[PDB]
Amino acid sequence: MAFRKSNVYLSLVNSYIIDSPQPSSINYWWNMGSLLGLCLVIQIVTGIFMAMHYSSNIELAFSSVEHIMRDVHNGYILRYLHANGASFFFMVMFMHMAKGLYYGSYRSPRVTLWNVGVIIFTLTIATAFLGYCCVYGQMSHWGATVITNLFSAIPFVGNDIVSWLWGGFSVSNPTIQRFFALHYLVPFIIAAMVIMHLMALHIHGSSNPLGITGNLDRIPMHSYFIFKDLVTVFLFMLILALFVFYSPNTLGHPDNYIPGNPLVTPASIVPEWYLLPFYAILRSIPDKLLGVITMFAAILVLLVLPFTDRSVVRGNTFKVLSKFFFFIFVFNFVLLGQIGACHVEVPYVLMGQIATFIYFAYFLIIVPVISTIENVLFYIGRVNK
Amino acid sequence: KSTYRTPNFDDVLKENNDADKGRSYAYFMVGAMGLLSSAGAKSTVETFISSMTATADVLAMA
Amino acid sequence: QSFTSIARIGDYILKSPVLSKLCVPVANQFINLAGYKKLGLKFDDLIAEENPIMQTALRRLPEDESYARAYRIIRAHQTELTHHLLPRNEWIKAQEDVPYLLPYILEAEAAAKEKDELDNIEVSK
Amino acid sequence: AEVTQLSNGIVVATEHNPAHTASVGVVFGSGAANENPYNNGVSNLWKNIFLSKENSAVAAKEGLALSSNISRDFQSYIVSSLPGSTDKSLDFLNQSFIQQKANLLSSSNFEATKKSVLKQVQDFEDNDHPNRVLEHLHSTAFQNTPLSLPTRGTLESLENLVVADLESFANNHFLNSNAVVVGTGNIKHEDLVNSIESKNLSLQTGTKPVLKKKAAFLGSEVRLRDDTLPKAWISLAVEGEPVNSPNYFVAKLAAQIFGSYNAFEPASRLQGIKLLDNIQEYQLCDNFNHFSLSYKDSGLWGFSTATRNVTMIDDLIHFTLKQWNRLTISVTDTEVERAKSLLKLQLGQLYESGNPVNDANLLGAEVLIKGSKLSLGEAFKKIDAITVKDVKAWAGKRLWDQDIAIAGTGQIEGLLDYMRIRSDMSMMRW
Amino acid sequence: SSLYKTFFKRNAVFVGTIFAGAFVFQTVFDTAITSWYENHNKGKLWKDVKAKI
């Protein structure tokens, strides 16, 4: 028996990245997984390095960040990488989620896999918002404010949970310093959460575009998918470099270059681009509590998918009505995020509400209704009993 | 030595007149241990949680 | 969704002359648009097998049919990974797209359903 | 139906059903439970000399059949013959327990019988693993008590016994107040009771057998590990119910709920037994069987089992004991009704078989303990009477969080520590 | 002991009964200590020096 196999530590590395049996037909959407792994590293490495210069103290916070930009060697490269790496993390995460949502990866025995993934989504969004607060720019302060207040919606203990988090009468020093503390901690949890995502992946292996079994034709992970992955890794770095070096601030908000101020919320306040669709869903409900319940629901609704997809076959590759309605969901999602960047004005409010309906109606009505029809359609189209 | 000839446990085997003695003692102990531990847990948890609530120096009533 | 239920609804549409004429054409059309046929696969191949009922059926599926299914699937992946379709004369034809696995399934579901019933039969004296 | 019983100078009991043969025998109210750790097997010896080649050739010429049986509470000597030759039986029996009680005990016949039960008892301890384990369960469950002594007797006490021991024992035990003459087959009650009242005498009348110390159950285990065996035979039980107990039938029904099973018989696999869904996925055993062993002062409720899945022995135990948990908290009506129907059936196949010696060994047994026999009809009556509330009350007393006795031989490395097993006797609750 | 058999009847103490009891303890136990402690230090405490004023 070979060493890479016999050693206690290399056998793990071996069965995961070298000998791992993969379905020969998996396309490039299967490359998003490793990309996320890379992202987690870029964020973590860049963060720890920047942390050596950061000061969580509210009076020093914003300036320590500028100190990184202006005085630390390659400090700007560190900051722009971390900030943009944060957005790419989401562009990729969304794609990774979409691929699965399309190819029915949330089904069959891979539910636990999907459920772990949903936790990682909730956690990543959290980590991201904790870090956004650390710059303590105008957007920071107000993001810090609004989001913590989301909990003041809880009926009885509400305000108490909120002031507990703040650690004061409002968002002040205690808030920003514990927020950095936590922004450092969660990433390591995400990392742990990832290894579980991997363990859950590893017992059934990846699926494939045909949505059928890949047991008949396997090819090792090494020297195929190790090199195929390399292609996307580079492609990924190439585009991230284009942003970091030639357009570092395009993905950001200008208000964050103005130090946070507790007496003035800027009329230009807008959430980070990756939070918009969710922001939009909340705005579309004129009730305080329902607004937050619906928003959180929009995330939790993804857990429902393995039960509402009644189809007898996996994936959208061979379903005309599903492929259609899938893209209707994708674009709807983009429209949702667009409404979010818009104002609360006449045509947009109603639009936001119609789309919110669609969003939820996708997982609850369309999919089950559509798939049942396709099951029957598939049957009668060839049965002559 | 025959296997049907069970060894002597008369040094440990309790002379029963109160069959449920070992049980009553064990379960009290176990239960008592459990009681104090929930209390200690509740106490540890509250200590940490409350270390986040507003610090003395920030309760400045203006 | 159970095939027991699919066939229950499907047969009913098929058996009625009114519904039949209004659905089947749409059905054959939906099937051609799916395209699995152009990848050399019979729809039954597309059924997901990671569940006991399907395992029971595939286990019960006679050799000839199994080895062929094996080929069809291997063939499909190979084609799919090359980003081509098979040459038209290799495409699974309409009278080939036969529901071969279907009866074994229906039987396996039937057997399962019964056991469940017999495991909860209430008694009345 | 039948079942008559009248005392004279002794006590006669019979139950005749016009069949094909007639069997007569004397059942003594003392067995291994009455032996001492040092003369263990004195009864297996008595049984063996009674069935001796010399003694058998005698009754053979006459056309009689000799059958004996050793148990814990009692033991018997029975003779079968044709319906009319009921007198022929009486002569041979009375000849062997009065006149010839000087013969048979003759050396070279006893020295031969001694070597017979020796290469016999050894053969059992060397090859009949399932029952050897079953006998060891009693050995440990009831250790240092009457019920803890094996019927066939130990292999050491056996080789130390002599004609003096046989006589000694026989004298303090084969009495009149401690005996009941049984007749089963087709011979009328008045046809034997009279034929017995013919030859007078008494033979040590007025003497009662020696008393002792009431059997007891103790949480313990004996692990006869032997990695050379191909399987792993294990037996596990709790303190069960004694004959003539308010729950004699409730207990018997419980065992039937889980019943017995044999992985290799197609029909045994389709049984309406919940535990079966768990045991079959990985084939946790080749067979198991639940019992409700009832003795005079105690009993053993549990199950025996054999498996080749030595790596998953802890799951066999776990699933089983967790199923038993149900009898206290969630056993269902349809589980009980099935049990009844199946109990009435298997209980029926026992009490009414096509063998008189069988009816005999069952008759002598009850009249010796309860001074009467319970009619199968009365049985079925009490059985149909049991409700779920009853099965639950019993489980909460006998099963839920109670000590157990474990016994096993073969590849039992995988059988876990007492405490683990002892802990599956219950379930967590708020 | 027969005191256990009346209260819990040969069944281990339940997890719900444990927590319930755990609360009672917290308050009871605490006050006891607080008191013994204040008393033992009488004359030194602020409550005591505040009275002499």
Ligand code: HEC
């Ligand atoms: C201490 C290590 C550290 C880790 C680990 C870390 N960060 Fe940060 N992060 C920082 C520091 C320091 C800042 C403040 C400087 C800055 O803005 O880059 C920051 C800022 C941010 C910002 C604000 C964007 C901006 O304006 O620069 C975001 C968003 C962010 N982090 C996302 C993430 C995400 C997502 C992860 C993990 C997947 C992560 N961070 C992990 C240290 C870390």
Ligand code: HEC
């Ligand atoms: C909402 C769901 C979800 C989220 C978020 C998610 N995953 Fe996944 N992941 C999946 C599912 C489901 C699969 C299986 C898809 C398949 O192979 O058919 C998967 C598969 C993978 C794969 C295999 C390659 C591939 O893309 O199929 C890796 C590696 C992976 N995920 C890494 C991660 C990492 C690292 C993160 C984030 C830090 C993450 N996942 C977040 C759902 C998710």
Ligand SMILES: C/C=C(C)/C=C/C=C/C(OC)[C@@H](C)[C@H](OC)[C@@H](C)CCc1oc2c(O)c(OC)cc(OC)c2c(=O)c1C
């Ligand atoms: C220590 C951790 C704590 C206390 C709590 C963190 C967890 C909360 C989240 O989920 C993880 C949360 C990020 C939420 O998820 C529902 C996102 C979708 C964000 C939704 C969000 O963002 C905004 C934002 O960024 C803004 O910027 C200036 C401004 C905003 O209005 C002015 C919003 C806003 O109105 C909403 C709804």
